[PDB]
Design a binder for this molecule. Structure first.
Ligand code: MG
Ligand code: ZN
Ligand code: ZN
Ligand code: ZN
Lengths: 262, 93, 35, 84, 168, 171, 521, 88, 58
RNA sequence: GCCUGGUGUCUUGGGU
DNA sequence: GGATTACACCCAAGACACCAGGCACGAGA
DNA sequence: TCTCGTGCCTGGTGTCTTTAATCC
């Protein structure tokens, strides 16, 4: 058995291509003298090929666009063969982490599994809004909080049993969502409970002004700053903001420019 | 304030001015060092008034320095590459 | 020291044997094979 | 140990331009922090001006510690160094 | 904050466990080495003080300073009021009163007699004066370092200490 | 355990204190800051020797701040206790967990598992005491204990004693 | 003064001791162990403990205090973590020196191949400089091609008798070719970091010194990396590209790659390892740790970001015009500076500079309040930041600044001695004036300010020559000293009249020029 | 929020032609919501700090992706003064 | 020049930098031993004693 | 009722 | 047969991950 | 009402072969 380096993600394709070549050449004068070929997911970027002569390995891969042209094949020891073909949990009452949907990343208890053996019913702390803005994603979801049936009663619900309600077509029993997930959609290994899981389980600014005394008499402006007695008017006419005393200003109101009786 | 302006102040001999420009008028920073191991490993809670370099088990022989922030940054980048820059405040020969 | 460095460098910035900047470069670079 | 006795002092008896600048600035700084001034202050009230007045009358109460290359040093008072 | 003549103490390759203070093993730490240096660099033996020496120096220093505070003008409770602050008042009063109830030779006449009698590691010489003993058997038990020295006089030490000792 | 130690203190002086009695101010300043204070490195500093005659040296002016730095070298009476040292004491308190004894500045705690069985705490007696027949441990009774451990808080140090050994106890 | 009071004594730096950080020390200063490459808890706010933004490493956010020192983000320096490596790897910087050490020592017990009995070698240990001594030793021992079990009776030197290999570098891998005992077949096997690591710990203290290393500061097995120090977030801050979208620093992404790669080395040794897979995964951990420190390794392709451009390694952070040393330490950007086009004025004194009013209201000088100027300074405070001559801040001895733009009760301030008033720039204040390129010392001279209308800097015409300035578009820079000490340094050392004669050619550098010189003839 | 004035914006979030503007004034108001009331963050555009003038014309349209799209042109007049550059 | 190489080599051979150069002190932001920094300034306690007594520190 | 944050890395075109 | 060296400062305008797989919603039968 | 197809969003992961001088 030789290993061969191939383009990442193209290992299954190379195994396929080798099979087509083998079957197409069976019984001809130039058979492909390989016995088998395979690719292990755990071993990214490699295909393994079974044969008697190295030349057959080169023959199997000739012209394959997914294989690195460098003469990189390597020999496997007989004592390493079976480990290449090693094929490899989940119990009711145990915890898993959800891998998809608004509950992605959340800890859940395994309640039960389907007869066929694919999806598992999970007990989950819900993330609900009680229909508050109706007329969901994992990035725009809700905080987790146990289902409250009286809140649902008040705001937006079918009773099914003691402590069991169907609310918006999902089932909540004693405050928890019970929802089926594909087993492939949950993580059962190396779960690390989090901290949180251990805990749980002046009236004239900006108004337009006219100046009635001084060298700037008759000009429009806006009150930029009115700290005290001395105002800052941003004059319109030249690009300058001036310091000015409060006796000098007329303010606009409902009827004309009004003195300091506004 | 580039490299060539630095040289001009040396030529004038205006050492005091050059120090101030590059510290008080810029990125001056205060750090604490351990008097034993010379590293900036001191954990300083100023409202509790308690200091400790955990490595040396030392709560008494501790100094403060005024250095540029960009120099503090430089030493932390050197630490991240396993280089130890030990700042001591006294000579020995 | 610094005064010496500036006093020599500044005239160079405004300036059959080799002369001028290429000759100056040979000296500081103490080249084993001069031109 | 490192200190050199008064009779055996060898460095120059004139105040250098660098020593002068440092003395004026340091003394100016102390006056602006309300150190007791040793001369009469008339009309000239800037911190630098008062310090320059004290220098001209040989009344600045500071000592120069001039370090020599080996680390030893001669202490010279600004009262005894000759200022041009 | 406050520091001493002894400095640096930079890191060495081999550690040391002769540092932990143990009076039995003569380990007084890095500050109280056998040979110290004063503020001029001169060599000097470690100054360990018996209860009798210490009572004279501290009391003298306080009354000379008190006289100096008075421009140049006995009881322990009066001598402790010279300090400044109630924190300082406490530690000084408690130290005199403690010494007032455990210093055998409470005057300079007897003390100088004890001084000349005692004046060989400097720490052991100071220990023998502080801890009163009756016989040779009592000294080498409580102070087990005097065992393998093979130089007694111990008995005449204790006899003179007990004879100079006033009744109570 | 009493020693004489040559110490020094860095003092920073604001420029407004630059007057003709500068040294006398510093002498008062040194004493106020150092007398009665404790450090784990030296112990309790009881009294400073020759305070009115201390030579303060010359003050270094700090560049950029104007303030002056003095290194005041001095000599003091210091008190630090030591592990292994046998000492006498005066009991301050008696409790079910042992007793507390004032040895000058500080207090030493001796726990019950290091006290001999025949010394029995007697509250009914007047006044309360640890009693025997020819032994009498009331407040002010000379007792002889041995310091078996020193813990450092750098502000006040704490030492634990024992009377679980030969010749230690009341005398 | 901008620093809150601390009882620790203030001192300056007298010595910098360089060295290596031991594995033990890295753990002693670390405040957390780093294991998980997922930065966020689960994208629901608050970053994950044990992750790369664990809050014990520090705060780069104005509202979360450091859980280690209690200080705000301004004062908090940041605290290091550590990352345990499943297998020891080489430090990319030290490989050529490691290679040199192999030819010096025995590859079994680690003893120096020569003794003081060799006369030339006894001369070489006397060389005082550690680097030259180490090289002189290696220059001798290089030709010694076998580690002798016996001294050169049988006197043993502690040797093991093995012949030594010729070690060669091939990228990040070292190959050693041993000559097994004419010619036969030699088998060169790979010299892994772990193999070399054990050999180095058995080197004696006496041979450690003779190799120019140092028992306390640079112990030779510390050139192999077993635990990686995790720098705090101050070294690798996040930036927000378009406000609510933030990308991570190159180091943050690269540390994630090292951390992921570290977990897969743990994932191998417990189950399915087809050996030839262990070598591909371990070499990849070596790769990521190498390009994390230096991504300019000659002879191999650079690590790339997904954008296609090369990763900014730590080595590249320090070198070149814009790096930490030439760009932030030998020179840097500074406060209290200004710049504009210059114009000439014959009716200004030689040592004056005309300063535009708008510039004069932005720059400031912190003048200390004393008995002689307190009445004068109160007048400036009433005028405020917008009327000249005025003032911008009042600074108390504690450091709190009062911003006079927003203080509506400005009339109710009474100044205490010792406070500071940051007043506007005013007539006869000295300032440092400067035109780039600063070719010689008279490119920076101190002038006396004269405040004037219009927006150019004014120079008396006779100073154009030392600056090599003219008025065809040139700009010049002005710097304002910020304390009493530096004002005096400027006026007494750098001032224009002191600079009239230059030491370059013992002659003046300023004279009468252009119109005035034409006219005076 | 930015430190400048918002009082020149109309209700449509856009300033109108004819209004004089100075530096740091907001002329286009825009917000972005904060992910998980009091939910948005300012993303407005202020006038460049060194400039002034009059808003001349405001274009409103949509881009290729269908979202709203604005342009604000500001005009001012520059009068020769000390320091300005000229050449034959 | 050779910025990073110098520093790696400096680490591996435990170099001691005695901080006497101008460049050392400039980049650490400390007063450099040059010009106005080439000496220390001390307070003349002897000359202060010629002042009158009402100027005295209490 | 004090505090108060708006990016980076390049490339290209320019000024002296 | 290898890298390292190659003036200084400043202004301003002009830009931004890809592919594959899985899940959900809508439309048609 | 159920099934299939298409579109959108989220997560994970690269690859057909295609400027010149100097010194150590
Ligand atoms: Mg020009
Ligand atoms: Zn330490
Ligand atoms: Zn912190
Ligand atoms: Zn060997």
């Amino acid at each position: 058995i030789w290993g061969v380096k191939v383009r990442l993600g193209k290992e299954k394709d190379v195994v396929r291509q080798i099979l087509k070549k083998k079957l197409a050449r069976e019984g001809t004068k130039n058979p492909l003298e390989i016995y088998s070929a395979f690719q292990r997911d755990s071993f990214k970027g490699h295909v393994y090929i079974e044969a008697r002569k190295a030349e057959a390995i080169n023959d199997a891969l000739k012209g394959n666009v997914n294989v690195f042209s460098n003469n990189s094949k390597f020999l496997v020891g007989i004592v390493e063969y079976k480990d290449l073909l090693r094929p490899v949990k989940l119990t009711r009452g145990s915890y898993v982490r959800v891998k998809n949907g608004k509950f992605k990343g959340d800890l859940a208890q395994v309640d039960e599994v389907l007869e066929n053996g694919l999806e598992a019913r999970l007990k989950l702390v819900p993330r609900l809004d009680y229909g508050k803005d109706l007329s969901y994603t994992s990035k725009f979801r809700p905080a987790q909080r146990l289902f409250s049936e009286a809140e649902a009663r008040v705001h937006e619900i079918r009773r099914d049993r003691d402590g069991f309600v169907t609310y918006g077509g999902e089932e909540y029993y004693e405050g928890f969502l019970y929802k089926t997930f594909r087993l492939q959609n949950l993580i059962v290994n190396s779960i690390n409970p989090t901290l949180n899981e251990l805990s749980l389980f002046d009236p004239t600014l900006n108004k337009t002004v006219k100046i009635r005394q001084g060298g700037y008499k008759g000009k429009i402006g806006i009150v930029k700053e009115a700290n005290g007695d001395r105002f800052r008017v941003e004059l319109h006419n030249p690009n300058k903001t001036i310091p000015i005393p409060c006796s000098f200003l007329l303010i606009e109101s409902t009827h004309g420019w009004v003195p300091y009786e506004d | 304030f580039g490299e060539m302006e630095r040289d001009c102040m040396i030529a004038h001999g205006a050492a005091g001015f050059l120090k101030e420009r590059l510290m008080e008028a810029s990125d001056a920073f205060r750090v604490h060092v351990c008097g034993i191991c010379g590293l900036m490993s001191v954990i300083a809670n100023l409202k509790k008034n308690q200091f400790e370099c955990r490595s040396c088990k030392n709560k008494t022989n501790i100094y403060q320095l005024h250095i540029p922030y960009a120099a503090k940054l430089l030493f932390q980048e050197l630490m991240a590459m396993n280089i130890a820059p030990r700042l001591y405040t006294e000579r020995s020969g | 020291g610094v005064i010496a460095a500036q006093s020599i460098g500044e005239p160079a910035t405004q300036m059959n044997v080799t002369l001028g900047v290429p000759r100056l470069k040979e000296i500081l670079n103490v080249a084993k094979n001069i031109k | 140990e490192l200190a050199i006795l008064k009779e055996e002092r060898t460095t120059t008896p004139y105040l250098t331009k660098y020593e002068r600048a440092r003395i004026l600035g340091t003394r100016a700084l102390q006056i602006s922090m309300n150190a007791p001034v040793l001369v009469d202050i008339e009309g000239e009230t800037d911190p630098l001006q008062i310090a320059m007045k004290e220098l001209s009358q040989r009344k600045i109460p500071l000592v120069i510690r001039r370090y020599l290359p080996d680390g030893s040093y001669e202490d010279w008072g600004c009262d005894e160094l000759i200022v041009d | 904050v406050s520091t001493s003549t002894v400095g640096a103490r930079r890191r060495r390759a081999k550690q040391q466990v002769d540092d932990e203070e143990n009076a039995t093993l003569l380990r007084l730490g890095p500050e109280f080495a056998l040979k110290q240096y004063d503020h001029d660099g001169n060599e000097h033996d470690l100054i360990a003080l018996s209860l009798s020496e210490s009572r004279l120096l501290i009391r003298e220093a306080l009354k000379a300073r008190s006289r100096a505070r008075n421009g140049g003008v006995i009881d322990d409770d009066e001598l402790a009021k010279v300090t400044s602050g109630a924190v300082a008042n406490g530690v000084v009063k408690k130290t005199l009163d403690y010494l007032n109830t455990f210093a055998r030779f409470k005057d300079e006449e007897t003390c100088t007699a004890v001084d000349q009698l005692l004046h060989l590691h400097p720490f052991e010489i100071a220990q023998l004066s502080s801890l009163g003993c009756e016989d040779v058997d009592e000294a080498i038990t409580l102070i087990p370092s005097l065992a393998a020295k093979k130089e007694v006089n111990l008995q005449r030490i204790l006899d003179e200490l007990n004879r100079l000792e006033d009744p109570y | 355990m009493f020693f004489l130690k040559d110490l020094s203190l860095i003092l920073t002086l604001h420029p407004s204190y630059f007057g003709p009695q500068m040294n006398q101010y510093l002498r008062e300043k040194l004493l106020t800051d150092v007398e009665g204070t404790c450090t784990g490195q030296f112990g309790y500093i009881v009294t400073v020797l020759d305070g009115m005659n201390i030579d303060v040296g010359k003050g270094r002016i700090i560049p950029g701040s104007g303030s002056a730095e003095f290194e005041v070298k001095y000599r003091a009476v210091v008190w630090k206790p030591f592990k292994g040292e046998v000492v006498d004491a005066i009991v301050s308190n008696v409790s079910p967990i042992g007793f507390f004894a004032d040895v000058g500045p500080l207090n030493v705690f001796v726990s019950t598992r290091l006290i001999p069985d025949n010394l029995v705490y007697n509250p009914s007696n007047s006044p309360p005491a640890y009693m025997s027949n020819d032994e009498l441990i009331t407040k002010g009774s000379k007792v002889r204990l041995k310091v078996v451990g020193t813990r450092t808080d750098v502000n006040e140090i704490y030492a634990i004693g024992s009377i679980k050994e030969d010749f230690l106890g009341a005398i | 003064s901008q620093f809150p009071y601390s009882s620790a004594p203030l001192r300056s730096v007298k010595e910098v001791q360089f060295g290596l950080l031991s594995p033990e020390e890295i753990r002693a200063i670390s405040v957390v162990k780093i294991e998980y490459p997922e930065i966020m808890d689960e994208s629901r706010q608050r970053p994950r403990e044990g992750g790369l933004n664990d809050p014990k490493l520090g705060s780069i956010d104005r509202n979360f205090k450091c859980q280690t020192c209690g200080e705000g983000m301004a004062e908090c320096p940041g605290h290091f973590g550590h990352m345990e490596l499943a297998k020891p790897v080489f430090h990319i910087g030290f490989i050529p020196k490691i290679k040199k050490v192999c030819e010096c020592i025995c590859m079994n017990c680690g003893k120096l191949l020569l003794d003081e009995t060799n006369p030339t070698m006894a001369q070489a240990i006397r060389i005082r400089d550690p680097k030259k001594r180490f090289n002189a030793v290696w220059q001798l021992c290089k030709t010694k091609m076998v580690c002798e079990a016996d001294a050169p009776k049988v006197v043993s030197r502690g040797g093991c008798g093995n012949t030594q290999p010729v070690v060669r570098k091939d990228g990040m891998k070292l190959w050693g070719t041993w000559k097994k005992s004419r010619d036969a077949q030699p088998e060169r096997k790979l010299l892994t970091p772990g193999e070399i690591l054990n050999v180095f710990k058995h080197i004696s203290p006496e041979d450690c010194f003779r190799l120019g290393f140092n028992e306390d500061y640079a112990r030779p097995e510390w050139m192999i990396i077993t635990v990686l120090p995790v720098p705090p977030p101050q070294v690798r801050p996040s930036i927000a590209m378009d406000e609510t979208t933030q990308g991570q620093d190159d180091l943050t992404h690269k540390l994630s790659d090292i951390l992921k790669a570290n977990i897969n080395v743990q994932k191998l040794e417990m189950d399915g390892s087809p050996q030839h897979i262990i070598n591909e995964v371990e070499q990849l951990l070596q790769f990521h740790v190498a390009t994390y420190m230096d991504n300019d390794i000659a002879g191999q392709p650079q690590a790339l970001q997904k954008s296609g451009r090369p990763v900014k390694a730590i080595r590249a952070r320090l070198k070149g015009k814009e790096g930490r040393l030439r760009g932030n330490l030998m020179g840097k950007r500074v406060d209290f500076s200004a710049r504009t086009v210059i114009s000439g004025d014959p009716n200004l004194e030689l040592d004056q500079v005309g300063v535009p009013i708008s510039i004069a209201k932005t720059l400031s000088y912190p003048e200390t309040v004393t008995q002689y100027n307190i009445h004068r300074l109160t007048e400036y405070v009433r005028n405020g930041p917008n009327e000249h001559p005025g003032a911008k801040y009042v600074i108390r001895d504690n450091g709190d600044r009062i911003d006079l733009r927003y203080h509506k009760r400005a009339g109710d301030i009474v100044l205490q001695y010792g406070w500071k008033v940051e007043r506007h720039l005013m007539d006869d204040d000295p300032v440092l004036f400067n035109r780039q390129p600063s070719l010689h010392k008279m490119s920076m001279m101190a002038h006396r300010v004269k405040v004037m209308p219009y927006s150019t800097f004014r120079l008396n015409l006779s100073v154009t020559s030392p600056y090599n300035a003219d008025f065809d578009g040139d700009e010049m820079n002005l710097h304002v000293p910020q304390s009493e000490e530096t004002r005096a340094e400027l006026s007494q050392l750098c001032a224009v009249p002191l600079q009239i004669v230059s030491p370059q050619s013992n002659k003046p550098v300023m004279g009468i020029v252009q119109d005035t010189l034409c006219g005076v003839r | 929020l930015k430190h400048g004035t918002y009082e020149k914006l109309d209700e449509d979030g856009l300033i109108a032609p004819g209004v004089r503007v100075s530096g740091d004034d907001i002329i286009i108001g825009k917000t972005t919501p904060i992910p998980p009331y009091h939910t948005k963050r300012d993303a407005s555009t202020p006038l460049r700090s060194t400039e002034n003038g009059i808003v001349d014309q405001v274009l409103l349209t949509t881009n290729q992706e269908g979202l709203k799209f604005v342009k604000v042109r500001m005009r001012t007049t520059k009068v020769p003064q000390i320091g300005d550059k000229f050449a034959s | 020049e050779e910025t990073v190489e110098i520093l790696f080599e400096a680490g591996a051979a435990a170099e001691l930098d005695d901080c006497r150069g101008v460049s050392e002190n400039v980049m650490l932001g400390q007063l450099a031993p040059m010009g106005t920094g080439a000496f220390d300034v001390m307070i003349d306690e002897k000359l202060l004693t010629s002042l009158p007594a009402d100027y005295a520190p209490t």
